[PDB]
Every structure is written in structure tokens, then in C-alpha cells.
Amino acid sequence: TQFEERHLKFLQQLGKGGSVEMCRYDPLQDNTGEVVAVKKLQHSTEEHLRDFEREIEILKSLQHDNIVKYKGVCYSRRNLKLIMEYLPYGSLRDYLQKHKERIDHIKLLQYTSQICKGMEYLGTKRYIHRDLATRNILVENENRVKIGDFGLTKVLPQDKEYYKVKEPGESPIFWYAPESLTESKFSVASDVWSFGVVLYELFTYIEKSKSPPAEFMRMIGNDKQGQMIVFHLIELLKNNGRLPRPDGCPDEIYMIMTECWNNNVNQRPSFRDLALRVDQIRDNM
Numbered sequence: 001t002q003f004e005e006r007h008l009k010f011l012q013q014l015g016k017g018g019s020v021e022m023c024r025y026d027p028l029q030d031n032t033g034e035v036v037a038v039k040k041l042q043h044s045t046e047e048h049l050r051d052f053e054r055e056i057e058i059l060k061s062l063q064h065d066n067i068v069k070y071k072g073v074c075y076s077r078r079n080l081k082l083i084m085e086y087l088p089y090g091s092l093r094d095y096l097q098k099h100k101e102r103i104d105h106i107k108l109l110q111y112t113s114q115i116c117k118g119m120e121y122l123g124t125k126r127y128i129h130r131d132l133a134t135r136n137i138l139v140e141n142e143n144r145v146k147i148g149d150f151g152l153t154k155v156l157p158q159d160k161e162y163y164k165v166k167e168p169g170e171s172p173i174f175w176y177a178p179e180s181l182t183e184s185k186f187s188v189a190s191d192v193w194s195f196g197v198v199l200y201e202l203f204t205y206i207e208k209s210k211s212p213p214a215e216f217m218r219m220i221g222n223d224k225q226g227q228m229i230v231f232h233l234i235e236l237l238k239n240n241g242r243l244p245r246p247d248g249c250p251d252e253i254y255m256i257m258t259e260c261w262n263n264n265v266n267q268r269p270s271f272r273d274l275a276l277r278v279d280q281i282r283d284n285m
């Protein structure tokens with residue numbers, strides 16, 4: 001089913017990544033329409049449009065409880081709008097920064113298992129998210145989270161287990177595996193490294209002073225700037241410099257983070273095994 005542009009009523013700006021707006025799709029024009037999230041492009045260049053069309057195809061191909069729902073496209077070709085369900089509790093980063101320790105460990109592990117499940121499903125389609133962070137996870141309700149923003153997602157070539165990015169754009173370097181920093185190589189294993197960073201974000205309750213950029217900048221020295229940050233971060237990770245155990249983090253959860261942060265790509269755990277491990281921890285708790 002088609003969405004007519006004229007019937008998309010702007011309600012509120014949600015955020016910028018392209019931008020996402022909360023809209024009411026109201027073809028009856030009586031304000032009874034469904035509230036949806038709408039992604040559109042700021043700079044709709046031929047390159048960005050081709051890349052956005054790929055994100056649309058990726059999201060449309062995913063049907064999982066822990067993946068944000070594709071609804072449709074509004075064409076009303078060169079100015080596409082991606083229509084998705086609107087998740088009312090916001091990003092997990094915002095949700096956790098607001099409630100903090102009121103979200104207990106059993107609740108954090110329920111979200112962790114769900115993130116692993118959405119990620120494991122994505123891997124079955126040979127998709128590499130490349131931007132797994134709490135800012136890209138949405139909260140549907142207290143019992144369900146979903147992965148969002150497939151804007152950096154790559155499809156693995158037929159004959160390779162990695163995707164090489166030739167000319168990188170803005171990169172979330174503080175969530176990047178060493179091989180992503182050194183060779184711009186992205187794989188299921190590098191999303192697993194990012195997942196360990198997400199686990200760290202959760203157990204630090206999004207405390208700004210404890211954030212992965214704040215901690216890695218302290219380890220490399222706050223005097224490092226621009227490309228020197230990448231140079232020093234690479235040497236730090238090579239020499240086993242890592243984010244600390246968050247205060248009050250259960251030992252078994254910290255063990256998982258450290259295993260995701262293995263310099264050896266092949267030694268990192270799989271998302272299938274991480275969901276099994278997290279569910280066992282939840283069961284024991």
C-alpha cells in the first residue's frame with residue numbers, strides 16, 4: 001500500500017543521522033491517522049539517494065521482533081521517504097540515560113538478549129550493521145527493544161566474509177574493531193566487537209564521563225586530535241588497552257564484553273552463542 005505525501009502531517013522532529021520525523025499519516029484529514037516515523041534526506045545527492053534506496057531495500061527485507069518495522073515508501077523517485085513504525089519510548093540511549101539504575105540488571109539482560117537476536121537474524125541475511133550503538137536501538141515498551149538505523153549497513157560480497165569500505169565517511173571510531181580502524185574491514189565479527197561496546201554502554205547507564213569516547217580519549221590522552229586519535233586508538237587496542245569494567249557490572253557480563261573485544265577476529269563469539277549465554281545468565285538470575 002502507498003503513502004501519499006500530501007497526507008503526511010509533520011508532528012515533531014525525532015533526530016538527525018538524513019532526518020527522522022514523527023508524522024501522522026492522516027488521509028481522512030480528521031487527525032485520526034496512524035502516527036509513524038518518516039526518514040528523509042537532507043542532501044539528496046544521486047550517491048546519497050542510491051545509498052538510501054539500498055537502506056530501504058535492506059529494511060524491507062527484515063522481519064524480526066527486534067528489528068524496527070518497515071511500513072512503506074512515499075514517492076509523491078529523486079525525493080523518497082521511508083515510512084516506519086514509530087516506537088514511543090525513544091532510543092535506548094535516551095531511555096537508559098533518563099531512568100538509569102531504575103532499569104535493573106535483569107531488564108538490561110532482557111534488552112541485551114533481544115539486541116543479540118536481532119543481530120543474529122541480520123547476520124543470516126549476510127548484512128553488516130556497522131553502527132551498532134545504544135543510539136541505534138529503539139524502545140517499543142518496557143519489555144521490547146528493536147535495532148534501528150540501517151543507514152551504514154552493507155551486504156557481504158558472495159565470496160567474502162568482510163566488506164571493505166574504500167572512502168569512509170563519518171565513522172563511530174570508538175565502537176570500531178581494530179581491523180575496521182586499520183583496514184576499513186567490516187564483518188559479523190566487527191559488529192560483535194561493537195555489540196561488546198553496546199554492553200558496556202548499558203552497564204555504565206550512559207554516564208557521560210564513562211562513555212566510550214570519554215574513556216578512550218583519557219587512555220590515549222585528551223591532547224590527541226583529528227587523525228592522531230585514530231593512530232593512537234589503533235596502537236592502544238593493539239596493546240590490549242580496553243574500556244574498564246563498569247562499576248557494579250556482574251563479572252560474567254564483563255567477561256562477555258572482553259571476549260567481544262578480542263583482537264583475533266575468529267576468537268570473537270557468535271551472536272547465536274551470545275543470545276544462548278545471555279539467556280542462561282537471565283535464567284540463573
Ligand SMILES: C[C@H](Nc1nc(-c2c[nH]c3ncc(Cl)cc23)ncc1F)C(=O)NCC(F)(F)F
Nearest residue numbers: 014015016017020037086087090136137148149
Ligand atoms: C535519526 C533518528 N533519531 C532519533 N529517533 C528517535 C525515535 C524515537 N522513536 C522512533 N521510532 C522509529 C524511528 Cl525510525 C526513530 C525513532 N528518537 C530520537 C532520535 F534521536 C534515528 O533513526 N535514530 C536511530 C534509532 F531509530 F535506532 F533510534
